């Protein structure tokens, strides 16, 4: 089982205040590693919109309620996943003008960890070992 997660008003405050927020254990480490395993395989750009080939992406978004959480932080009625990127390093996260992005770490110490943010990726908030990958999720209203 997994507890139901709930945004506290302080998480909202931190995001309103800094324009981003970082959550430990945002998504289950099991779904994460398990998705990364299918991603390393899917390699016969390849890394763009992996959700159009792997059901695991939209299942994490839908089952961890990232979409509703994103909307809640940004005071939107509804957002939806419109794009994604499987990245190996932080410099691959380029500007996107969507309502809210969520970086989700797939492997390593920081696996299952997730960062919500709008605009350009926040340089010194989150990073992952050279052996680790992550996936960036763009949510739009």
* Solving technique: X-ray
Resolution expressed in Å: 2.5
Q: Which residue has the tokens 């969520």?
A: 102
Q: For the chain, which domains are there?
A: 1-141 (3.10.129.150)
Kindly list the strands in the beta sheet with 80-87, ordered across the sheet, starting from the edge strand earlier in the chain.
20-23, 114-117, 100-105, 134-140, 80-87
Spatial distance between the Cα atoms of 117 and 34, rounded to a whole number of angstroms = 25
b/e map 111-126, b = 16+ CB within 10 Å: bbbbbbbbeebbeeeb
Counting beta carbons within 10 angstroms of the beta carbon of residue 99, is it exposed (0 to 12), middle (13 to 18) or buried (19 or more)?
A: buried
Spatial distance between the Cα atoms of 116 and 101, rounded to a whole number of angstroms = 6
């Amino acid at each position: 089982s997994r507890m139901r997660a709930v945004l506290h008003l302080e998480h909202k405050r931190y995001f309103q205040n800094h324009g981003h927020i970082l959550f430990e254990g945002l998504a289950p480490v099991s779904d994460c590693k398990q998705l990364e395993a299918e991603l390393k395989l899917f390699l016969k750009r390849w890394r763009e919109n992996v959700h159009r080939t792997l059901p695991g992406v939209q299942m994490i978004v839908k089952r961890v309620r990232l979409d509703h959480l994103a909307a809640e932080l940004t005071h939107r009625s509804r957002v939806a996943l419109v794009r994604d990127l499987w990245v190996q390093k932080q410099e691959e996260i380029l500007f996107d003008d969507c309502d809210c992005s969520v970086l989700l770490c797939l492997s390593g110490e920081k696996a299952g960890w997730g960062l919500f943010f709008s605009g350009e990726y926040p340089q010194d908030v989150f990073d992952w070992g050279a052996g680790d990958t992550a996936i960036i999720l763009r949510f739009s209203s």
